[PDB]
């Protein structure tokens, strides 16, 4: 406890919310660099991620988010259908820009494009499917935090959040909870114990 008190232990509600969204199910391939965040692989089956280690590292990611002076410098990216609504809702509740769907490569390098931005931080849903964004992010010295499953590239990614990264409920739940911690760390919620008034299903996707 050099730089953190004992109030940061996960609350009782969190663990059920996490294992109710099937966030502990991975793919067959196991990356070598994420081996430390792996206990063991199930006999004749998938790997299992530790949501307990997810909790503190996610809090640290929120602590990274709060450090930026104005929220408008944070940018969040998503391309797969499963994350457009969750990303836009996260952008609406906190302060951040969101890029959903096609990325239009050249956004951070060309100063004549319509979508020209000068962000200070990047949040990525999936390194594999948003690999192109990382490539230009590596040109102008911007850190990136990204959500990763058991198998995923780690190029130029300082912070990786181990999650299912492909489930319907897991991605939305993680994005909602991340918003919850950033607001908790600010003065909006005013208290750790009081519950938030928004329901988990808001950060989901609907077919039509």
């Amino acid at each position: 406890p050099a730089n953190l008190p004992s109030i940061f232990n996960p609350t009782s509600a969190d663990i059920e919310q996490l294992l109710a969204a099937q966030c502990h199910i991975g793919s067959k391939n196991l990356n070598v660099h994420m081996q430390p965040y792996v206990w063991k692989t199930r006999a004749d089956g998938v790997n299992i991620i530790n949501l307990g280690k997810t909790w503190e590292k996610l809090v640290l990611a929120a602590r990274i988010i709060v450090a930026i002076d104005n929220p408008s410098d944070v940018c969040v990216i998503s391309s797969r259908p499963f994350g457009q609504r969750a990303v836009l809702k996260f952008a609406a509740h906190t302060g951040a820009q969101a890029i959903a769907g096609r990325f239009t490569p050249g956004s951070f390098t060309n100063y004549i494009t319509r979508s020209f931005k000068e962000p200070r931080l990047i949040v990525v849903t999936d390194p594999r499917t948003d690999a192109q964004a990382i490539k230009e992010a590596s040109y102008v010295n911007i850190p990136v935090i990204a959500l990763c499953d058991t198998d995923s590239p780690l190029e130029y990614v300082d912070v990786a959040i181990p999650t299912n990264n492909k489930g319907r409920h897991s991605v939305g739940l993680i994005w909602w909870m991340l918003a919850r911690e950033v607001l908790r760390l600010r003065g909006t919620i005013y208290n750790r114990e009081t519950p938030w008034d928004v329901m988990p299903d808001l950060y989901f996707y609907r077919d039509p």
């Binding site: 050099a2 503190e56 990274i64 590239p153 780690l154 190029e155 300082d158």
Partner: protein, 86 residues
Amino acid sequence: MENDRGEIVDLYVPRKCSATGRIIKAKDHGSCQITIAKVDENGRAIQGENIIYAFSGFVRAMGESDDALNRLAQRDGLLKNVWSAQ
């Protein structure tokens, strides 16, 4: 840095990588700075006081900067039982 009679003569002094100790050259794109906020006793975020880390492009290119961050956080008491030696 060099000196002759106690006065600095170098044009500038570069910084060093925290993970490996190599100096980060100018125009070395892919090297980033990480700022982590500091929380108080009741959970609020203290403004203006923070500890800064720097990572060079070489370690990012190899992809181990996440583990380096784990090492730095555990050394400065930011995380619990996330890194260990087998």
